[PDB]
């Protein structure tokens, strides 16, 4: 992924305000809510009966934190996403058999979460930069 310095700065500045203990849990929870078949993958997480059950799920939040850590990792290795996400690709593709369309969905839900949290700051140009990032990540994961 190639970001102009302008874009890099914008992306970074907003990422610096992200609540790391929370945003990932929010993004994953919303994925489970908005695209219900994804719950099939997290049957061990417990009660995912309702949006409330899902959003409050302790395991969702814990897991959400791991997902976010991966995006942060991506942000730091934009020039080598495929090498960086090699292991994750293998995990999701070969072992879990997650269809690649779902990676795009998680990325889009993450964008919705940022928009939700930063409103006015999440301008069109900032969104444009974040879309390149999340497409890059989705592409690396689907490499396998």
């Amino acid at each position: 992924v190639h970001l102009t310095p302008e874009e890099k700065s914008a992306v970074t500045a907003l990422w610096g305000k992200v609540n790391v203990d929370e945003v990932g849990g929010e993004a994953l929870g919303r994925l489970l809510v908005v695209y219900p078949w994804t719950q099939r993958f997290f049957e061990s997480f417990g009660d995912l009966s309702t949006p409330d059950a899902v959003m409050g799920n302790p395991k969702v939040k814990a897991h959400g934190k791991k997902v976010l850590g991966a995006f942060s990792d991506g942000l730091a290795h934009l020039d080598n996403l495929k090498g960086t996400f090699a292991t994750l690709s293998e995990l999701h593709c070969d072992k879990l058999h997650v269809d690649p369309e779902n990676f795009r969905l998680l990325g889009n839900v993450l964008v919705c979460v940022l928009a939700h949290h930063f409103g006015k700051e999440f301008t069109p140009p900032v969104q444009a930069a974040y879309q390149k990032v999340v497409a890059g990540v989705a592409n690396a994961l689907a490499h396998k």
Binding site: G29, R30, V33, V34, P51, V54, M55, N108, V111, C112, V113, A115, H116, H117, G119, K120, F122, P124, P125, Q127, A128, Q131
Partner: protein, 141 residues
């Protein structure tokens, strides 16, 4: 297919949009054009610059169409038939473009109505936009 609660959620959230429908539709377009440049290919005759009068004008038409869809949620095909004709038959818009606009719409709303943008409403809106998209991409008349 929309459930009874989905329909309630849409009506309630679109109700909050209200008079801002026009600016939100305009912002959604701008968001799509910047983020997914290939979409610009459908508007070669447009000034797509920031604050363009044409985009502004266009965002108003889109939002009006959505308001009409919400009011005819149980009868979309009939209400949107003219729009279906235009996008499916005349313009031949590739279905992927509808997913892009829908996404940009959700981002605009989340940005503007954070309190209203709950997981449940988010899910209802997503389903609604998918439904609108299906009608506009189909040739049934």
């Amino acid at each position: 297919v929309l459930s009874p609660a989905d329909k309630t959620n849409v009506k309630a959230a679109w109700g909050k949009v209200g008079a801002h429908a026009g600016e939100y539709g305009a912002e959604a377009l701008e968001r799509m054009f910047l983020s997914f440049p290939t979409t610009k290919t459908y508007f070669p005759h447009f000034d797509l610059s920031h604050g363009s009068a044409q985009v502004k004008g266009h965002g108003k038409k889109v939002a009006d169409a959505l308001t009409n869809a919400v009011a005819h949620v149980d009868d979309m095909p009939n209400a949107l038939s003219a729009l279906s004709d235009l996008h499916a038959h005349k313009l031949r818009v590739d279905p992927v473009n509808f997913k892009l606009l829908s996404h940009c719409l959700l981002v605009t709303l989340a940005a503007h109505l954070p309190a209203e943008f709950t997981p449940a409403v988010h899910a209802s809106l997503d389903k609604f936009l998918a439904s609108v998209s299906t009608v506009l991409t189909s040739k049934y008349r």
